[PDB]
Amino acid sequence: AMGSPIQVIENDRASRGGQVYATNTRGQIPPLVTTDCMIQDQGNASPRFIRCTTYCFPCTSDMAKQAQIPLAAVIKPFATIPSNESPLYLVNHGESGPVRCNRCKAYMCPFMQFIEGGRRYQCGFCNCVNDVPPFYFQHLDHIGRRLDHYEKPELSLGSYEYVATLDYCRKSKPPNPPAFIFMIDVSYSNIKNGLVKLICEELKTMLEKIPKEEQEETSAIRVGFITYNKVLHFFNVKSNLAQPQMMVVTDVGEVFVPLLDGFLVNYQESQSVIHNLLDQIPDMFADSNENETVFAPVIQAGMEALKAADCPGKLFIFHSSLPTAEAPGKLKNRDDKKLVNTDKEKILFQPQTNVYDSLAKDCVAHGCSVTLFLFPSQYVDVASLGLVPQLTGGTLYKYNNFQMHLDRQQFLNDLRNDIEKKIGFDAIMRVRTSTGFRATDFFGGILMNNTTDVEMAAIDCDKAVTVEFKHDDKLSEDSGALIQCAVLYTTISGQRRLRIHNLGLNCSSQLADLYKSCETDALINFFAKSAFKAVLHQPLKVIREILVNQTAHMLACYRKNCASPSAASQLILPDSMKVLPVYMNCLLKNCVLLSRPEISTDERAYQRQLVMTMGVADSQLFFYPQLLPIHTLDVKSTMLPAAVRCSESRLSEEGIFLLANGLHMFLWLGVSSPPELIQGIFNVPSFAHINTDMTLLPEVGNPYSQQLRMIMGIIQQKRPYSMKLTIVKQREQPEMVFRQFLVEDKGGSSYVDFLCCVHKEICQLLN
């Protein structure tokens, strides 16, 4: 009988919740992402910015190879910090720029040991001695505190930002503020489903909420508008035209932007002209009878437009179907049954043409990020349409078989949300480490040309990059392992800025210490991304095998080296890894690593992408849904009910539950479901009275319909995508889908089965 996910999540909330986590100790283990506590910097970076698979690295390569515990870090450089937590400080080092070690180039941080009266500081990453520049010199005092420490954030805090001098800028000149280019697919499909009008009409409202720093009064971000269908329609919206102009480019294949000045303007200055155009677009194409569309050319154009205005930018593309019109990036309907031991299954998850990868490079090359709002209704080849936006650091929003009376709010919520996102532009993340180990692999919505620079055309508060480390030499159980994440980027006001995240981990020659410091959620996030990237390179059966065997290996190692002697009829799991098996099985059951029977390739490619960007909070929830009992709800005096295991066993014919994974939210209803509730919620008297196909927001209700809406709100709170509500009536209804999210059941193997399997191979490693 194993300690369940829920039990583990609850126990930690009890012992560590509502308590200040001060990041002042070195290899300190933080609370679970599921636990809500207050964080105070104090030296090391907040667990909100970076978490690790272990907070104590093995001292040597062989030790690491014994345990086989992947050493990695999940980093969300711009994680949203709670209002009740101290904000980052902007540090300015003047003309010279931020002080750094001449050798390893690490930034001035709490890890530099000032010596010899404070004239020379020895770098904490490579041990090189440096000369404290004139303007920065300060006296040490008792053991070095240097009478500065607590006064300068870069010396006492784990996270903070530096002002970047011109030599941190492209072409050694101050960058320009970014621009948002909205590009609308106006082919038939989107004209009929009323999407075109929806976007144009709603766009008049949202263009106001465009981000702008407090230090400024109006946003420095300008905007541009385009429509298309195998042909591009650019629009001139200069702040001196009572009427907007339209320039049509038909030379797809050798696309170009027919403008400069009139394309990319201050929305405020050209307000009436833009609105004018926005009122028009819908009518303009109303009778369009075009069905084929292009795609690469659109990205190609927006990028080109930005390259010309010589500024970074973000493309908001609204597309509907598979781009079949002849032109580069033309996509065929290549969905094939090569997927079980095909060994050629990887091809399904890769773009068709070789153009998309290039376009992505060109975009990153010019700091152009592309975010895609997709409204397919049939195959669309997501592996292709999502590449550029994934590599460009953008976001992919897919609304299958879009229907206005149902999905309007889901989309408009995502859109608003996305436009208001805190975002950096034309960025490059570099992760420096202390002597002994180094960053050797990266996973995220990123692009890399060399092996040290993670390039993100755009980055937001939701994106997380997962970094794997490997042993370079040997670490000292005395100095431990250090980490410094640095992200150079341009702000929405056009300022070159550096964000720093320092973290000090412990190191040890003892395996006990390695395990005692692990974090299942962190490990699960790595394994998932690692596996998902591998899908595009190896047979899934090979990937799954590696996962299972690494899992059995980690546990077998602990068994034969740390665990006190116990019977062979028992399987021993370290506290740090209590729920690791459960989650591992969830990853293995996931559609991305599974197969054909149902679930479209488009659904697999999509999910595979969504995870690649996830932080630890997100992956934890994604792989282990949250199941809440609603019928047993405490009326008005609530605070979100206790979660219940992800198994059918915890469902009751008399109950009503809420299941959410971060993308989907299911409202399950049992047959003998109390009519009292069905009334106070769906306003109808009985169970058989509800129609699933009407999954829209139900108001009314005084005690319950309100208490349920309250929790649906609190659940969505920290979640980036606005979840798609899906009502499920018990017995033989859509439920089949629902059953998939009861990850503890068989549905691959059940939790128990997988446990049973692991033990077999752990025993096979005879010990």
Binding site: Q570, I572, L573, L755
Partner: peptide, 7 residues
Amino acid sequence: DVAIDMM
């Protein structure tokens, strides 16, 4: 440490 009887 959590132990489980596989039997």
